[PDB]
Design a protein around this nucleic acid. Structure first.
Lengths: 169, 128, 97, 270, 181, 45, 186
RNA sequence: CGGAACGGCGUCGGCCGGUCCCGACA
RNA sequence: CUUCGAUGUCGGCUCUUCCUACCGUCCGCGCGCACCGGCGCGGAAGCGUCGGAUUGUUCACCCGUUCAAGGGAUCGUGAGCU
RNA sequence: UCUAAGCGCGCACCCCGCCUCGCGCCCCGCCCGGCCGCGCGCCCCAGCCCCGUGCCCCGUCGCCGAGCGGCCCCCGCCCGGG
C-alpha cells in the first residue's frame, strides 16, 4: 500500500567493526510492518535476526502518480499444496498502487494473504514488453469499450426505494 | 453508443467528487480509469468505472495530456457547455441547488409543493 | 390543539433502541423522511418532534437527539416514553418551533 | 423393524373424511365438458331410485365368450318424473374460477319450488319472490337480465325443480338442481335455448339415450357408528383376544407420537 | 476486448435486423429468427452482418460464431432451400410411406409388420415428398434448416425397433443426404 | 441391402460407449458428454 | 407495486419493512415476479418444500399454497414476526393479487428498481417467472389470469389514447398562480 | 452445502518446455 | 454417557407409516445382445414381494404358486393380545 | 461435436384433473339500507431512442358530487316420522 526503502545492518562487533548495510524496497501498509518484513527477509537471506541487527532508516517514497504505467511484478507465494513462483503484470499509476492491485488479485484468485507472498521484484514493463493479454488489451493506442457495468448506477435505487418507472440504462 | 474512450465526459456517480464533471485520460482496466477535471474541481485520480457514468460529449484530447494540456483543451472544447445546457446538465444543476437546503428551506419548499399539488387539482377540475 | 398550522416533516416511530437481547425504551428510533444518510441527519438533529397518542388524541412531544446508523435513522427521547402500541405510527418534525 | 409380510393398506384415503354428508342430496360437483359447436343438449337430470329387476340381453361383444350369447344382468330403475325449468344462471370463468353473473327466475314459480324455500309451508309468511313476481311479468325485466347473461357469461345453466307430487315420495318440496346447457355455437345460443325451456317440463327421454353411459351421483345407505372391521375391512383378531377381536390391535408405533390419519378408527359408516 | 465475427449478406437476400430478431427475405420465403436469448451487438454495416459480443468470458466467446452461422443458414435456406433425403431401410417387411395433406405430413406403415400407424406432421415450412427418381426415399424441402432438420429427426425417431439388437435389426428411416438444393 | 445397411450402421453401430456412463458418444470423442471428462470408450460389432 | 420483474425475496424484504412501518402495501401482478435459478431447480425447490407435511394429519401441517400471490404472501410471512401482534397486524395490512384486479386497476403503481431482476441478476443467471412454477405445482388460473390481463391491457391503451389527449389540455393550462410557485420553487 | 483417494474438454489464473512468415507433399 | 423411590423383557398375530443400498413391473443405454432368454448400468419407491411342513424362534431349511429385494419406526407394535 | 446460447421427444415416478372434505365467498330471494376510500398507459434493458426523473403534505386543509372500488347488515325452533 505505501512503499518504503528500508536500510538495516547487523550490530557492530569487535571481530567485525563495520558490518554490511543492506537495503530492500518493501511495499507495506505502515512503517512497522515494513520493518517487520525487512527482518523476516534479512533473517533467512543473510542470517541477521532483529536482535542482532539495527534498522538505520525506513524511508517512505511518495512516487508521482500523474500518468499510468505498466508494472511487472514477480512473487513467490505458498498454497496449501506448496510454494509457487508467479509473474503478474498490472497497469497502475504507481508501484505502491500496483502492489495493492496484485495483492487484491492474489487474495481473490490465489487465496494468498500478504504474509504468504514474498515480492522478488517489481518493474515498469514498457508497452512493447507486456506479456499478459489483460494488460496488453489496454496498452493499444485507442481503446474504446462500452461501460463495463452501467447497471451499477443502482446506487440511485437505495436512496430513491420506490420509483414510478423502472429506470433505463 | 457512449463508450469509455479518452475524453469522454464522465459524471461522477460516487466518491469524494460526486456530482462533478471530469474527462477520462487513460484506461487502466475495464474496472478502472484515470480522470481529471481542470475546468471543474476534480483533481487527477484513478476511479472505478462504477463511480463514473458516461455522458454523450467526448472532448478532443492529446494522449497522456498532463493537467495543463488537458485544461487548455477542456477549456477550449464546447463539450462541457453542450452537456451543461442539456437536459441531464440542467437536472445536475437543479440537483446541486437542492442539496444546499436548510431545514427552514425544506419547509418553505414543502409548502410551495403542496400549493402546486392543489393547483393541479384546481386546473384539472377546470379542464372539463 | 397546540399543533394546528405546524407544517411538520413526515417521520415514523420505527421502534425502541434495542439489541436482540436488551431493549432500551428510554430512546426511540425515528425514520425521518428525505433523510437517508447519517450526515444528512444533522439538519434535523435537536429538533422538536411529536407523536399523537392514539387513545388520548393529544401529542406526546419529544426531541431528536443523535443519529442511529449510517442510513438516517435518528435516536429520539420523548417527554414520557412511547407506549409500544405507537410503533409505526407517524412522528412530526415541525418545520417551525 | 419391517412388517415382514407385504400387505396393502385396507381402505381408500381419497374417500376420507368418512363423515355423514353435509350436502343435502347428491350434488353433481362437476359437469360434462362444454364442447364447442356440439348439438345443444342438457347435461343432467334428478331421479329417485325405485328398484332393481334383472334383464335377459343378447350380448354382441366380439372376443368375449358371451358373443352372440344370452346374459341375465342386474339393472336399476330410477323414477324420473319431468322437471320444470325455473331459472337460468350464467357463470363467467374469471381468475377466481366460475363466478355467477346473475340468476334470472321465471315470472311464475310452481308451489313445489316455493315449498323448498320455506321450512313449513303452512306456517310460512310466504314472502319469497313477492316483489320479484311484480318486477317480472312485465316481460322487459327478464329480457334485460338475459341480455346481461349473453354479454357477460360463458357457462349457462338451467335451474330445474323435480315434481314430487308425481312421485310416491312423501317429500312435497322440489329438489332444485342446476343443469348445464352444453354444445352451443355461441353463449347466446345456449341462453336462447334455455328461454324456450323456461317454466316448461324437461324429460329424461330428451336428456339421455339408450346405450349411452351415465354417472349416477348419490348419498349411500347409512349404517351409523360402525367398528373398524366393518367400516375399513380390517382382519378380526384371533378368538382368544382379551378385550375382543373386533379392533385394530396397534394404532401406531411409539414414533410418530400421535395416531395417524391413515390408521383405521371406528365411526360413521354410510 | 470484443469477440467479433462477420457474415457477408448475399444480394439475393434482403435482411433486416431489429433488436436481436433477424428477418431474412429470399426467393423461397422470409425467415425470422430471434437471438434475444444471448448478448450480441449484431450490426448491418453495409453488406456485412457482424455479431460482435463484448467482454467475452468462458462461453460468451462461443456466441459470435454460432449466431453468424445460424444467419448464413437462413440466407442459404431462403436462396436455395434445404433438402434432407431420408431412405427407408428394411429387410423382410417393406415400409409404406404415404405423403398426405398438401405434402405437409407422412404416414409410415408396415414397420416390422406392426399394426401401429405412425403419422409425423411436418413442422410449418417443411414439405415431405417421395423420391421421383431415388426409390424408398423421402425428400424434406423447406427454407428453415432447424424446421427441415427437426422434422426428419421425428421421422427417424418414430421408426425405432422396440427391444432386439439394433446392430442386427438395422431397419428404420435414416437421413442420407443433407444439402441446400 | 448394402448401402442402406451402411447408412443404418452409421446411425446404429458407429459410436463410442463410455465404460462408466455407458453413454453413446461420437467416434472421435475424447471425454464422455454425460460422465463428464470420462476418457474410456469402445463400441462392439 | 407491480411485481413484474421483481426478484421474489428482494422485493419481499423491501415490502416487509414497509408493512412494519404501517404503510398498507398492495402487490399486483405477483405472477410476473422472478425467482433466480434454472426453472427445473426452482420448480424442484417448490416441490421439495411441498413434501413437508405433518405425518399424523396433513391438515394440521404446513400449508402449501400453489397460487402466485399466495406464495408471494408466505414469502413475506417469513420475513415478518407474524405470531406477535405487530407482525399479525402488518400481515393484515398486506394485500397481494395476481394480475391487476378491478380493485387495484385505478391506483398509481410504483416499481422498486433495487429489487428488479434487470438491474440485479447478471445476463445468464437463468431467470424464472413465479407463474410458471405455480402452474407446475398446481395453480389452476394461469390461463384465466392472462385472458383478463389481455383485455385489461386493451382498455388500458384505449384509455391512454384519451389520456394523452386530455393531458395536453391540462399542460396547456400553464398560466395561473402555478407559475408563481414554480419561480419560487428553486 | 461434514468429507477422502481419485476423476473433469466447467471456468479463471499460473509454472515449465516444443513448433510457427525454413507458413505452424502441393 | 443417560435411566436402578422401575421407561415391562424375544418371536408371532394385528395395524399404519417410512427409506433405498431396486428383486419383478416402467424408462433408456450397454453385452461375449440372431431370437428367446439371461447379464451389466443410470433414472424410478407407484404397485407387487404370497400359501404351507419342522422349529418359541427372527434366521434356517424344504415343498408349492403369478417363482417371491433388503431394511427403519424405544432391536415399531403388552392399561392391544399371546 | 446432443450443449456452451438455441430446439425436439421423453418414465408404473412427480404435479394437475376426476373423485372425498371443505373455511370462506358468490349469485339470488326476503330486503333492497347505511358506512368508508379518492389513485390507472404499456413495453424493453446488447437500443437503453434520449434517459441518469418523479412523488416527496394522509391532513401538513385534503374532504361536495360524479364515477369507480370496497365494507357491514340480512335469513327460527319444539313436535311427529324416516
Amino acid at each position: 500500500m505505501q512503499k518504503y526503502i528500508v536500510y538495516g545492518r547487523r550490530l557492530p562487533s569487535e571481530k567485525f567493526p563495520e558490518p554490511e548495510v543492506f537495503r530492500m524496497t518493501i511495499y507495506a501498509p505502515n512503517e512497522i510492518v515494513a520493518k517487520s518484513r525487512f527482518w523476516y527477509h534479512l533473517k533467512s537471506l543473510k542470517k541477521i535476526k532483529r536482535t542482532h541487527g539495527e534498522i538505520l532508516d525506513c524511508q517512505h517514497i511518495e512516487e508521482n502518480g500523474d500518468f499510468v504505467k505498466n508494472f511487472g511484478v514477480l512473487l513467490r507465494y505458498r498454497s496449501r499444496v506448496g510454494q509457487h513462483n508467479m509473474y503478474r503484470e498490472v497497469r497502475e499509476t504507481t508501484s505502491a498502487r500496483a502492489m495493492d492491485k496484485v495483492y487484491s488479485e492474489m487474495a481473490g484468485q490465489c487465496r494468498a494473504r500478504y504474509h504468504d507472498i514474498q515480492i522478488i521484484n517489481v518493474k515498469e514493463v514498457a508497452d512493447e514488453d507486456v506479456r499478459r493479454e489483460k494488460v496488453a488489451m489496454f496498452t493499444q493506442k485507442g481503446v474504446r469499450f462500452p461501460h463495463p457495468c452501467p447497471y451499477v448506477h443502482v446506487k440511485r435505487a437505495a436512496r430513491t426505494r420506490f420509483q414510478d418507472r423502472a429506470p433505463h440504462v | 453508443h457512449r463508450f469509455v474512450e479518452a475524453g469522454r465526459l464522465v459524471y461522477l456517480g460516487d466518491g469524494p467528487d460526486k456530482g462533478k464533471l471530469a474527462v477520462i485520460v487513460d484506461i487502466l482496466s475495464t474496472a478502472a480509469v484515470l480522470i481529471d477535471g481542470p475546468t471543474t474541481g476534480v483533481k487527477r485520480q484513478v476511479v472505478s468505472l462504477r463511480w463514473a457514468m458516461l455522458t454523450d460529449q467526448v472532448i478532443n484530447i492529446s494522449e497522456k495530456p498532463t493537467t495543463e494540456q488537458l485544461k487548455k483543451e477542456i477549456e477550449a472544447s464546447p463539450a462541457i457547455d453542450t452537456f451543461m445546457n442539456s437536459v441531464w446538465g440542467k437536472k445536475i444543476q437543479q440537483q446541486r441547488l437542492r442539496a444546499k437546503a436548510t431545514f427552514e428551506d425544506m419547509g418553505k419548499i414543502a409548502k410551495l409543493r403542496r400549493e402546486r399539488k392543489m393547483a393541479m387539482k384546481r386546473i384539472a377540475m377546470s379542464i372539463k | 390543539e397546540e399543533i394546528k398550522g405546524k407544517t411538520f416533516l413526515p417521520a415514523i416511530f420505527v421502534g425502541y433502541q434495542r439489541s436482540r437481547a436488551k431493549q432500551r425504551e428510554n430512546v426511540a428510533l425515528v425514520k425521518v423522511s428525505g433523510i437517508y444518510t447519517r450526515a444528512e441527519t444533522d439538519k434535523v438533529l435537536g429538533r422538536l418532534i411529536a407523536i399523537i397518542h392514539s387513545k388520548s388524541g393529544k401529542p406526546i412531544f419529544g426531541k431528536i437527539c443523535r443519529p442511529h446508523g449510517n442510513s438516517g435513522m435518528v435516536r429520539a427521547r420523548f417527554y414520557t416514553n412511547l407506549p409500544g402500541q405507537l410503533m409505526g405510527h407517524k412522528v412530526r418534525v415541525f418545520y417551525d418551533n | 423393524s419391517h412388517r415382514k409380510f407385504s400387505c396393502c393398506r385396507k381402505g381408500n384415503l381419497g374417500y376420507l373424511p368418512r363423515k355423514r354428508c353435509t350436502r343435502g342430496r347428491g350434488r353433481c360437483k362437476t359437469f360434462p365438458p362444454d364442447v364447442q359447436g356440439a348439438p345443444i343438449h342438457l347435461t343432467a337430470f334428478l331421479g329417485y331410485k325405485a328398484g332393481c329387476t334383472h334383464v335377459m340381453r343378447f350380448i354382441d361383444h366380439r372376443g368375449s365368450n358371451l358373443h352372440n350369447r344370452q346374459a341375465i344382468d342386474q339393472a336399476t330403475i330410477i323414477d324420473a318424473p319431468p322437471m320444470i325449468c325455473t331459472a337460468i344462471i350464467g357463470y363467467a370463468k374469471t381468475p377466481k374460477g366460475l363466478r355467477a353473473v346473475t340468476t334470472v327466475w321465471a315470472a311464475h314459480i310452481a308451489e313445489p319450488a316455493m315449498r323448498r324455500f320455506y321450512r313449513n309451508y303452512f306456517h310460512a309468511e310466504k314472502t319469497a319472490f313477492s316483489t320479484y313476481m311484480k318486477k317480472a311479468a312485465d316481460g322487459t325485466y327478464i329480457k334485460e337480465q338475459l341480455g346481461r347473461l349473453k354479454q357477460h357469461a360463458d357457462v349457462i345453466r338451467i335451474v330445474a325443480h323435480t315434481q314430487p307430487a308425481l312421485t310416491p315420495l312423501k317429500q312435497k318440496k322440489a329438489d332444485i338442481m342446476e343443469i348445464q346447457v352444453n354444445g352451443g355455437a355461441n353463449v347466446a345460443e345456449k341462453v336462447d335455448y334455455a328461454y324456450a325451456l323456461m317454466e316448461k317440463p324437461i324429460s329424461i327421454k330428451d336428456v339421455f339415450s339408450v346405450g349411452a353411459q351415465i354417472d349416477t351421483i348419490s348419498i349411500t345407505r347409512g349404517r351409523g357408528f360402525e367398528g373398524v372391521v366393518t367400516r375399513w375391512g380390517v382382519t378380526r383378531l384371533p378368538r382368544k383376544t382379551r378385550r375382543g377381536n373386533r379392533k385394530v390391535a396397534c394404532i401406531g408405533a411409539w414414533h410418530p407420537a400421535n395416531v395417524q390419519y391413515t390408521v383405521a378408527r371406528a365411526g360413521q359408516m354410510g | 476486448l470484443c469477440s467479433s465475427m462477420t457474415i457477408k449478406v448475399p444480394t439475393d437476400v434482403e435482411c433486416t435486423i431489429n433488436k436481436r430478431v433477424v428477418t431474412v427475405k429470399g426467393k423461397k420465403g422470409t425467415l425470422v429468427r430471434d437471438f434475444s436469448h444471448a448478448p450480441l451487438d449484431i450490426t448491418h454495416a453495409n453488406d456485412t452482418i457482424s455479431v460482435a459480443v463484448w467482454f467475452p468470458r468462458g462461453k460468451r466467446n462461443a456466441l459470435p460464431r454460432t449466431i453468424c452461422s445460424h444467419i448464413e443458414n437462413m440466407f442459404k435456406g431462403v436462396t436455395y432451400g434445404f433438402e434432407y433425403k431420408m431412405r427407408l431401410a428394411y429387410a423382410h417387411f417393406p415400409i409404406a410411406a404415404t405423403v398426405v395433406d398438401n405434402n405437409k405430413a407422412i404416414e409410415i406403415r408396415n414397420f416390422m409388420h406392426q399394426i401401429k400407424t405412425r403419422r409425423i406432421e411436418c413442422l410449418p415450412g417443411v414439405t415431405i415428398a417421395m423420391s421421383t427418381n431415388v426409390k424408398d426415399e423421402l425428400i424434406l424441402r423447406g427454407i428453415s434448416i432447424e424446421d427441415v432438420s427437426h422434422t426428419a429427426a421425428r421421422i427417424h425417431e418414430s421408426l425405432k425397433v422396440p427391444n432386439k439388437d439394433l446392430r442386427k435389426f438395422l431397419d428404420g428411416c435414416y437421413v442420407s443426404s443433407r444439402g441446400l438444393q | 441391402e448394402p448401402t442402406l445397411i451402411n447408412l443404418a450402421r452409421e446411425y446404429n453401430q458407429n459410436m463410442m460407449i463410455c465404460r462408466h456412463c455407458y453413454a453413446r458418444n461420437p467416434l472421435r470423442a475424447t471425454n464422455c458428454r454425460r460422465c463428464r471428462g470420462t476418457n474410456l470408450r469402445k463400441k462392439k460389432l | 407495486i407491480d411485481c413484474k420483474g421483481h426478484i421474489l425475496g428482494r422485493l419481499s424484504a423491501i415490502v416487509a419493512k414497509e408493512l412494519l412501518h404501517g404503510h398498507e402495501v398492495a402487490l399486483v401482478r405477483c405472477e410476473k415476479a422472478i425467482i433466480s435459478g434454472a426453472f427445473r431447480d426452482v420448480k424442484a425447490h417448490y416441490l421439495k418444500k411441498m413434501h413437508k407435511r405433518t405425518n399424523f394429519n396433513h391438515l394440521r401441517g404446513p400449508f402449501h399454497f400453489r397460487a402466485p400471490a399466495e406464495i408471494v404472501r408466505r414469502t413475506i410471512r417469513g420475513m415478518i414476526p407474524y405470531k406477535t401482534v405487530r407482525g399479525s397486524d402488518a400481515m393484515s395490512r398486506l394485500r397481494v393479487y395476481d394480475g391487476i384486479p378491478p380493485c387495484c386497476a385505478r391506483y398509481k403503481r410504483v416499481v422498486c428498481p433495487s429489487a428488479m431482476a434487470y438491474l440485479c441478476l447478471r445476463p445468464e443467471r437463468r431467470r424464472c417467472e413465479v407463474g410458471r412454477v405455480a402452474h407446475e405445482i398446481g395453480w389452476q388460473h394461469a390461463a384465466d389470469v392472462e385472458r383478463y390481463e389481455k383485455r385489461r391491457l386493451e382498455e388500458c391503451d384505449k384509455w391512454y389514447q384519451d389520456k394523452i389527449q386530455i393531458d395536453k389540455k391540462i399542460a396547456e393550462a400553464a398560466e395561473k398562480d402555478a407559475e408563481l410557485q414554480r419561480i419560487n420553487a428553486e
